[PDB]
Amino acid sequence: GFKEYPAGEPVTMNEMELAAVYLQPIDMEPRGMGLPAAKADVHLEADIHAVEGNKNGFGAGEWIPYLTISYTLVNNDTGEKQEGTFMPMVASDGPHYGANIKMMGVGNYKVTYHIEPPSKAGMHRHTDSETGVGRWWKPFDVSYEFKYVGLN
Template sequence: MKRLLAIGFLSLVTHAAMAMNVVFGPDIGINGMKVGASFIQGVTMSPKMKGMPKHPDIHLETDVHALPGNPQGFPPTAWIAGLKIHYIVTKQGSSWKRQGYYLAMVAQGGPHYGINLKLDGPGKYFVTNYYQPPTANGYFEHDRAGAGVYPWWKPFTRHYSFDFFGAGKHGGY
C-alpha cells in the first residue's frame, strides 16, 4: 500500500513539474500594462509553421495585460492584442543567438505571446524583448475626440536572463 501511495505521489509531482512555468522576468508596470516573461517546456502549436523546431526545449512567453486605468481603453487584466514583439536570445559565453517575433496565441491559461525555441544546451541565457505598439501591426484606435483613447505608447525594451538546466530535467528549473 505504501509503495502504491509513493508511486501515485511521484506521478503527481512529476506531472506538476512538467507543467512548471518558470518566471524569469518579474512583472513590471509600464504604459498602463503589466509586462512579464517566462517559459515552459516546449509545446505543440497549431497550425504547424515552417522553421519551428521539431523538438523545442522551451516555449518562451511574454505576457502583456492591462492595468487598471489603461489609457488605451483595455479593461483591467485584459490581454493587450496586436503587439509586435521582437526577441533576441543569446547564451552566455558563446556566439549562439536566436531572434524573431513572438506569435500571438491562446492556451488554457489565456492569450499570450510565445515562441518555441531549441536552445544551445544548459547555461545562462539572455533575452531582449522589443515591444512595439499595435500600430506596428495595423491595429488602429479612435483618436481622443469623442469615444477615443490616448495615443499608443512609444516602443520600449526589456532585458531578462534565465538559467536553463537542460530539456527533460523537470523540476530542475
C-alpha cells in the same frame, strides 16, 4: 500541468505589466514556420496585460492584443545569441505571445523583447474626443534575467 518556469522579474511599463515565462515545447495550429515540438527545447512566452490607469483603452488585467514582438536571446556565459519572432497564441490558460525555440545550453541568459504597439498589426485606435484613446507608445524593449538547466 503544464509546469511553467519564471524568466526573471515582471516589469511594469507603459501602463502594462510584462513578464517572461517558458515551458515545454508546444504543438500549434496553424503550423508553421518555426520549429516543431520535437526540434525545439522550450516554448518561450511574453505575458502582457494592462494594469490600472491604462491610457489606451484597456482595463486592469486585460490581455493586450495585436502586438508585434521579436526577441533577442543571449547566453551571457558563452555570449551566444539568437534572434526570432513570436506569434499570438491561445492555450488552456489564455492568450499569450510566443514561439517554440532552440535554446543555447545551460547558462545565465538575458532575453530582450522588442515590442510594437497594436497599430502595427491592424488594430485601430479611436482618436476623436468623444470615444478616443491615448496615442500609442513608441516601440520599446523589455529584458529578463534567468537561469536555464532545461526541463525537469
